Amino acid sequence: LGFSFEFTEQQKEFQATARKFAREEIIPVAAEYDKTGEYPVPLIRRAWELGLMNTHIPENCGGLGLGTFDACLISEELAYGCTGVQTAIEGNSLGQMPIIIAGNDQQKKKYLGRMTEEPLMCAYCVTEPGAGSDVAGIKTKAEKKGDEYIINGQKMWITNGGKANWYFLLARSDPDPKAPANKAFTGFIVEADTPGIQIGRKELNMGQRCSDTRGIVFEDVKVPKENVLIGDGAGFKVAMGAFDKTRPVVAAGAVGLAQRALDEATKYALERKTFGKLLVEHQAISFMLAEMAMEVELARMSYQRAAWEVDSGRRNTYYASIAKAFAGDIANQLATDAVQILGGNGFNTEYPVEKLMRDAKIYQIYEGTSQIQRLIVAREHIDKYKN
Amino acid sequence: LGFSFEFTEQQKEFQATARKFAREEIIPVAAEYDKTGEYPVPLIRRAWELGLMNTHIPENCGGLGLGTFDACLISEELAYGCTGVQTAIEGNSLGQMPIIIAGNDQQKKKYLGRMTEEPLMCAYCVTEPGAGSDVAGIKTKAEKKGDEYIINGQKMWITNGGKANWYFLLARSDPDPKAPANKAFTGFIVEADTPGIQIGRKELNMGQRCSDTRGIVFEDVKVPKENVLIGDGAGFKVAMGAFDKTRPVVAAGAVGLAQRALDEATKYALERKTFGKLLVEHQAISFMLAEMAMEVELARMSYQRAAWEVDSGRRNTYYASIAKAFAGDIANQLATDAVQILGGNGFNTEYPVEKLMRDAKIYQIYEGTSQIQRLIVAREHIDKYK
Amino acid sequence: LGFSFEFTEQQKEFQATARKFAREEIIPVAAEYDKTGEYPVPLIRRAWELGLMNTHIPENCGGLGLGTFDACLISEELAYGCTGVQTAIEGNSLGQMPIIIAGNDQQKKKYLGRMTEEPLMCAYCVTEPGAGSDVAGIKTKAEKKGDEYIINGQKMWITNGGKANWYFLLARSDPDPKAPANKAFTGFIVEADTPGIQIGRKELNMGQRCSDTRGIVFEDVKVPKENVLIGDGAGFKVAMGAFDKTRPVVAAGAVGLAQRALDEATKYALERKTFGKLLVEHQAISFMLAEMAMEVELARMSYQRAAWEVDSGRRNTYYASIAKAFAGDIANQLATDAVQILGGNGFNTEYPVEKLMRDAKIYQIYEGTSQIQRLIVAREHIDKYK
Amino acid sequence: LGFSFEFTEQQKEFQATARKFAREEIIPVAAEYDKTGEYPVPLIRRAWELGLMNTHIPENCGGLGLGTFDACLISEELAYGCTGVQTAIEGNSLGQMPIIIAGNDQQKKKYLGRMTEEPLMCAYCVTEPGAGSDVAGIKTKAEKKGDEYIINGQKMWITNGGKANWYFLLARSDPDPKAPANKAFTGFIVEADTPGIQIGRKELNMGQRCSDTRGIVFEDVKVPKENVLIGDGAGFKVAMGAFDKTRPVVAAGAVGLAQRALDEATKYALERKTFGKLLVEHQAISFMLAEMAMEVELARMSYQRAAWEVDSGRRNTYYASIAKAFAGDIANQLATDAVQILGGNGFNTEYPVEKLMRDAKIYQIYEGTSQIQRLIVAREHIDKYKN
Numbered sequence A, D: 001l002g003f004s005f006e007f008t009e010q011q012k013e014f015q016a017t018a019r020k021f022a023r024e025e026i027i028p029v030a031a032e033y034d035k036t037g038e039y040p041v042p043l044i045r046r047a048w049e050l051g052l053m054n055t056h057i058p059e060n061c062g063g064l065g066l067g068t069f070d071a072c073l074i075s076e077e078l079a080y081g082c083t084g085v086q087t088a089i090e091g092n093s094l095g096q097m098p099i100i101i102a103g104n105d106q107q108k109k110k111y112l113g114r115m116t117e118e119p120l121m122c123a124y125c126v127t128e129p130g131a132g133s134d135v136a137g138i139k140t141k142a143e144k145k146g147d148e149y150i151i152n153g154q155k156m157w158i159t160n161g162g163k164a165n166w167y168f169l170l171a172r173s174d175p176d177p178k179a180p181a182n183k184a185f186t187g188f189i190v191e192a193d194t195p196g197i198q199i200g201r202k203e204l205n206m207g208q209r210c211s212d213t214r215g216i217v218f219e220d221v222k223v224p225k226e227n228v229l230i231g232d233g234a235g236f237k238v239a240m241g242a243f244d245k246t247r248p249v250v251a252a253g254a255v256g257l258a259q260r261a262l263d264e265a266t267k268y269a270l271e272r273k274t275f276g277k278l279l280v281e282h283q284a285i286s287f288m289l290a291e292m293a294m295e296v297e298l299a300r301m302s303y304q305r306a307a308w309e310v311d312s313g314r315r316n317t318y319y320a321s322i323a324k325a326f327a328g329d330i331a332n333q334l335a336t337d338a339v340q341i342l343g344g345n346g347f348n349t350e351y352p353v354e355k356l357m358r359d360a361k362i363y364q365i366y367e368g369t370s371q372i373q374r375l376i377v378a379r380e381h382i383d384k385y386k387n
Numbered sequence B, C: 001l002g003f004s005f006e007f008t009e010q011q012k013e014f015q016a017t018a019r020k021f022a023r024e025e026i027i028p029v030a031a032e033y034d035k036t037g038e039y040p041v042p043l044i045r046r047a048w049e050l051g052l053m054n055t056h057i058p059e060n061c062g063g064l065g066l067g068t069f070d071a072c073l074i075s076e077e078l079a080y081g082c083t084g085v086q087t088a089i090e091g092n093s094l095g096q097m098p099i100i101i102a103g104n105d106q107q108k109k110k111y112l113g114r115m116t117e118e119p120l121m122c123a124y125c126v127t128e129p130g131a132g133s134d135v136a137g138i139k140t141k142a143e144k145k146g147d148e149y150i151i152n153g154q155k156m157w158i159t160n161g162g163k164a165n166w167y168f169l170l171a172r173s174d175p176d177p178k179a180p181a182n183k184a185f186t187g188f189i190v191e192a193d194t195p196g197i198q199i200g201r202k203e204l205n206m207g208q209r210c211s212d213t214r215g216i217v218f219e220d221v222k223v224p225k226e227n228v229l230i231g232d233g234a235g236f237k238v239a240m241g242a243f244d245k246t247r248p249v250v251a252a253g254a255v256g257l258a259q260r261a262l263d264e265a266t267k268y269a270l271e272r273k274t275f276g277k278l279l280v281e282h283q284a285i286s287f288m289l290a291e292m293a294m295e296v297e298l299a300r301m302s303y304q305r306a307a308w309e310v311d312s313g314r315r316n317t318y319y320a321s322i323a324k325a326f327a328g329d330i331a332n333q334l335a336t337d338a339v340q341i342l343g344g345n346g347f348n349t350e351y352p353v354e355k356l357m358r359d360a361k362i363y364q365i366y367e368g369t370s371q372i373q374r375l376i377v378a379r380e381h382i383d384k385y386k
Ligand SMILES: Cc1cc2nc3c(=O)[nH]c(=O)nc-3n(C[C@H](O)[C@H](O)[C@H](O)COP(=O)(O)OP(=O)(O)OC[C@H]3O[C@@H](n4cnc5c(N)ncnc54)[C@H](O)[C@@H]3O)c2cc1C
Pocket: A123, A124, A125, A126, A127, A129, A130, A131, A132, A133, A134, A156, A157, A158, A159, A160, A205, A213, A362, A365, A366, A367, A368, A369, A370, A371, A372, B272, B274, B275, B279, B282, B284, B285, B340, B341, B342, B343, B344, B345, B347
């Protein structure tokens, strides 16, 4: 067999559909959605109709049953158009992943099945105002009371928080402070219409402005025991396990934004003249473009490797964290270099690059910060070492 | 003789006044001005009343007669509060500089003197839609017709463009395409109320949102010959010469923003706990803060050196471009590191750091981009060896 | 089909053979060869015996007929042991490549066939004292005189220069100064025993000290017309074309050195204690190692991509230059970080890391400098937009 | 009062003497000393005769009584010639500093006075095979036995280790493992001819090859109580205090090396032509040179600031560690950039730049590693914000 860097024919078809959608539908309206902060309902509904959403849902639940490699290639194309739109769409896959990997047949048919019938959204609730990077520090409480659990806590920065039909929620189920992380938490599926759920205001962030991000308070929220993933205490492994499939998709989003910044900068450098030459003819500008192209290519291969590893049935933690760390860093470098190449125009809102700079910063923060990715890569590298 | 890194007592007093003003008056309202994009008239008027504006105006024009070193120390304090507010105030010094260095007695008394009597603004017009870095590429035309020049052209990105009482304007006066840059341009003082001037829209930029930045159109604008700086063809040297005094001030602005980012990140890192420890206790975070402190200290000394050089009566081109290049780069690095240290909160508009990231990017672009600063440093550096 | 990051079974067997050879035979003697600068004849002979040399030689010439991907995986394992030894071995592939890609059957059987029978070395001569990066600037002359060419010129920095059985030589064949690069040069195969070939001293470089690097002068050297690759004027395309297959192999060498630096630093960090903890327990050290691991992994995939592209029958210029630029940079960053992690011991010659720092620098210079790789990437990138 | 970046007339005279010596005497022989590793006795003796060595010794001990600023300006000029030669000379100041700052009149007259009479060397012994960065981890024992201390332990990497007339030595005097660092150690002046001191082989390092660096064993070495600096347990503060005056001098050494790399690269770039132009005309090369010039200028001001701080009577820990961290980093960047600009010639030993790359690495390691400098700067910075 051997190495191959060629997509299958089906993958080329998915890529073509996602690219056409991003170019014809997302790009022409993304600046307006970023200005208004309006949730991009028409684009989400069109992505759903084109089969570009909920791609991991198994075929037996009415889904496409695609793998992580397929989700990444779609995600890169959507992100090229807008990561605000792509984050809303990807948010569904983040909420669904714990059910896909740890749900029983009933939970999958009920909660994933509904997503294949209508363009509903879902969300995942882990982060709290007091703890984000430190998942083992979460304080939202889950207490078993007969055939149900009572949830009390506050979650923060929830993507699709105000639009979700249901949430994946991680809560502390063991009151013992000495309980190890792998036994202390429970993962739940929570219907959004449950009494006691209080959704907060839309948060106003620097970037991905059309994505919906909110705080949510859970006050004595009743959850049936049938909505527990695996069982009491299995929450940490379910939530951590879901990153193997989602982290390469997030890295692909950063790559799409980076590719957009590179394309905008190159096209501008081929039109703008200074000192009697096109910008591409000034060696400092050509060297920047060369370095930007090197970074995009290497970041793309990093997510492709992480996606192929998990699709091959292997744990991909090391590769997925390398991809998230590297793609997150280079999306930020490319976005500021693209603003730089456009000069005064680059700093201006009528040009498309300043939005990319505002959007890119989230890739060093959400879904495991740059520092957390380094902590993971360090642990995996040190564990792999042998004389 | 001998090195010294201690301010004079008068300089400590100016620093204290500017610091108190930035911390008590600018900081509490800067987020609201960034949200609305409203021109910060009350703050500008208060800075003017406190003697923090137009500092280079000579004492014989009713000014304070301070030097570049004094302007920088004030600029750093104001920028710490908000670079949108500081850029509006600094814009006056950018417009005034060609008059201070090249104006005759009448031009200085008339145009600088009025600034000491009322909190008027001024602006400088060099950049055009077609040329910014390439000053020798400007196409705004100045045609001599008797005792006046007729100006035709469009200028772009002018700080205080819609608020200025008058402009410094650079225009091409030699129609011959083979005319060298040192003979082809003429610098003018142009009153903003002159018929034929059309002030454009407020440009909506990523950062420094409360600063007024506008395109300005000149259609058959009549300028008296008495408003020419030095003479026909001296424009390029006047405009280039003005950077010696303004470039260290722009670098000081970047330093103030960088110091603000460092302070916000350090204070947050002493309050936020993760994995059972304050962020400062995680070595990666302490190393980040140490590197950020190193960069701010070095960038501050870079502008101090460039300012002292010009105040000492030496050309400071090499030091001023090192300061602008380095301070511009580190303000950007520090602003993104401060957003990083605050995490999710850092990305949010209720915290002060994302504004710093949006504001910082202009320091790599305006008043000579990062690339242009490197071209200047290389030329000055290489000149020492040949 | 679809993507795959799994080697073939045959590739896993080659990797195992090369790894065992590097770890058991190269590593224990590499420090001694670096100290003496002795040409590593016993290791070269063992690599030849094991089938780890001249891997691109076609099966019809008695060779293994392996592709670029196979050559890269072997190169990475050898380089991990020592890039001085790996450069001597790789030097054979550099000299053979123009014959592999552009030789006729006679040239291939004669010159490649002899390499499969005995562990002979060969070399490639392009660089001159006056031109290295600028291949179109070469001045070595080739004058056609009946059925032979007369070569006159000086070549510089030739790997295996004093050990080669034959050379690939690029010379200017068109004396017209207006002749374009694609018509001005001719590529030749030159027997090393030809009268007129004068070998210089062994150059003493900072790193890869056991590799043989020498200047070579050709004084009225007679080369038969049957030794011309393709024909008069085809030299530039032959020499440029050879980089498609060799550049990923050079990048793989840089990755091997980088992997060795990472492994030596990690082993040390798992043994050395400071402040009551192993070095790995200090977050700054663990962050370092994480970044070093990220860089090695990405650099490895970059050469694997470039090697697969050319093996699949596509021009790989863009991917090959990305790989050489990135792997060359990271080998240098990793080697200095490894010296850093070992502290005082790292700076000392009894530890293995200072040799890695000295060896790594060549990867930013030979086989197309870091700057030249960026010029190539820029040209290939921009070409996609028109 | 008011800032000034102008040297005094006396400082311009010292600079001129040191520059003439480095350019006429050090530069022409530095490559030979680097090749042979021979200790540069003729250059050290000439530096001593010119008044360029032991500059901090007070005038009442027969010394020049110069400050840290004066020592830095001299150090930069010598380092430009060769940091191997400059480290041997600076080694004297490292050994003398604890006596200058903490010695009593008798100790200063005896140990410093002898250095003003003959070009003797001295050295400082803190580092051990088991601990370098972690000074509080040193295990060399000093057992008080009446009127003397018995020393047992091994020191490693001692500059001028085999050439010293006497050593400053730091040893653990409190056997209690719970003793805090500020009470556990004692600093001594130890005559090199004391029975029980065994000097190891010359260590062969990558760079500064002509500098003498050795391991030293102290086996039942008797040190009189009159040779104790301050008293029992004051060792840690004496050793740490000495860095305030020595750290800016080490940073000045890195700056001299960096300035040499920049000069060699610029001169070459003005002569070498490629693709029809001088290297300076290729924008990537001019941008490199501009960035190298920026770094050298900033690193020079960082040590000048740290030196002025201590000379003005202030603790300069924060500025000195910024200078050592920054100058150490930029000497390494400039040396590799100078090798790069020279191309194949740069990698070759007949050109002067590869020696600079090998020499530069020590500036990130000795006299407090890059990491240790960051730990110091972090502590100094962060503590200012605690209320
Ligand atoms: C727009 C947006 C959308 C998001 N979407 C979701 C979502 O849908 N669901 C959800 O559950 N969460 C979501 N999050 C939360 C996100 O995952 C967190 O912001 C992130 O994990 C960081 O946590 P934090 O903000 O609490 O920062 P903190 O954990 O407080 O960290 C602050 C800083 O310290 C660093 N740091 C922390 N611990 C260490 C350490 N041990 N060593 C070194 N450095 C350290 C971090 O890297 C960071 O730079 C989102 C966040 C944003 C802003």
